[PDB]
Design a binder for this molecule. Structure first.
Ligand SMILES: Oc1ccccc1Cl
Length: 351
């Protein structure tokens, strides 16, 4: 039952893959892992094959490997990335070192859609509808994506959308620093490690993305964390008394209280020309108090999506057992857990 593998070196990396994958072409490397595009002869699909870099190099990296695999094996939804395959060339746990993941090859992401194309309001409705449908699913499993931004959303020629890679390993400090797209969609409460936070951080991200689709420009293109905060508070207003209570870092409170009080702006005067319903939705997403932000299931029922909303076709997820997150194991234990997950993988049907 084990398939036959063949080897080849591409840009100083050995790839050993099942024969079913053909015409491997390097596509990139850095998000630690090399990625090749290939043709999968068994499904007829163009696929991206990611070879993980040093998956069990430390406890941290081994747990991260486990976490990514568990998450990708769970996601089964039209608007979310899933796993077509996962494999290793090893024939036993004792020689298990390398892990390859396989998913659908995506073309365009939303960034180059917003940069290269004029979207109508109908396109904005459809794109945002699909992000919220996918996010309803994700959140119903008690998973937080954490890294929703246009480059993480694949969009095909029919404007059909998929949410791609989850924020799994926290980004390094340096890659969130300065004038960088990496931070522009992040919710204020997690911009610094200064509050604990919920699923609705992803809803803030969606509001930022929706605003950019509507204007064609970044809503909060901050030059650093503090510049970005000031852009945010200028739009949504400074926190009142109700909300300053709920903040618990004293140092955060203390900086926040140094700021001059600003009222919430009028969104109809920021988003000139936009559908009044879109503006209404944005006001419900872009709220500082994260307890009061609209949820994805709530947002799907908003009147802006009246032409796409179907309550019998917005599925929720099977339960996702995340108890491993609180568990402490050695490298070889994490690794053996990963091996069982590779070995038990069962592919999606061609129907
Ligand atoms: O980003 C991913 C995820 C799973 C498989 C392949 C790639 Cl490139």
């Amino acid at each position: 039952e084990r398939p036959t593998f063949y080897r080849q070196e591409l840009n100083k990396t050995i790839w050993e893959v099942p024969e079913r994958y053909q015409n491997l072409s390097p596509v990139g490397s850095g998000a630690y892992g090399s990625v090749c595009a290939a043709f999968d002869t068994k499904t007829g699909l163009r696929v991206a094959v990611k070879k993980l870099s040093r998956p069990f190099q430390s406890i941290i990296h081994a747990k991260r490997t486990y976490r990514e695999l568990r998450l990708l094996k769970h996601m089964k939804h039209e608007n979310v990335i899933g796993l077509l395959d996962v494999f290793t060339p090893a024939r036993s746990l004792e020689e298990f070192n390398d892990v390859y993941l396989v998913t659908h090859l995506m073309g365009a992401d939303l960034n180059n859609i917003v940069k290269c194309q004029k979207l109508t309001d109908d396109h904005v409705q459809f794109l945002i509808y699909q992000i919220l449908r996918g996010l309803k699913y994700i959140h119903s499993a008690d998973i937080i994506h954490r890294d929703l931004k246009p480059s993480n959303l694949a969009v095909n020629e029919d404007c059909e959308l998929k949410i791609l890679d989850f924020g799994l390993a926290r980004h390094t400090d340096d890659e969130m620093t300065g004038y960088v797209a990496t931070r522009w969609y992040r919710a204020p409460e997690i911009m610094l490690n200064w509050m604990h936070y919920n699923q609705t951080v992803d809803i803030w991200s969606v509001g930022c993305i929706m605003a950019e689709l509507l204007t064609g420009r970044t809503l909060f293109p901050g030059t650093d964390h503090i510049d970005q905060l000031k852009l945010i508070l200028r739009l949504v207003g400074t926190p009142g008394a109700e909300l300053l209570k709920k903040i618990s870092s004293e140092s955060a409170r203390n900086y926040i209280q140094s700021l001059t009080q600003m009222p919430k702006m009028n969104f109809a005067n920021v988003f000139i020309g936009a559908n009044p319903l879109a503006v209404d939705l944005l006001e419900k997403m872009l709220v500082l108090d994260s307890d009061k932000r609209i949820t994805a299931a709530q947002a799907l029922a908003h009147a802006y999506f009246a032409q796409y909303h179907d309550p019998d076709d917005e599925p929720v997820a099977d339960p996702y057992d995340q108890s491993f997150e609180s568990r402490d194991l050695l490298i070889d234990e994490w690794k053996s857990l990963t091996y069982d997950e590779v070995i038990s993988f069962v592919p999606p049907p061609l129907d």
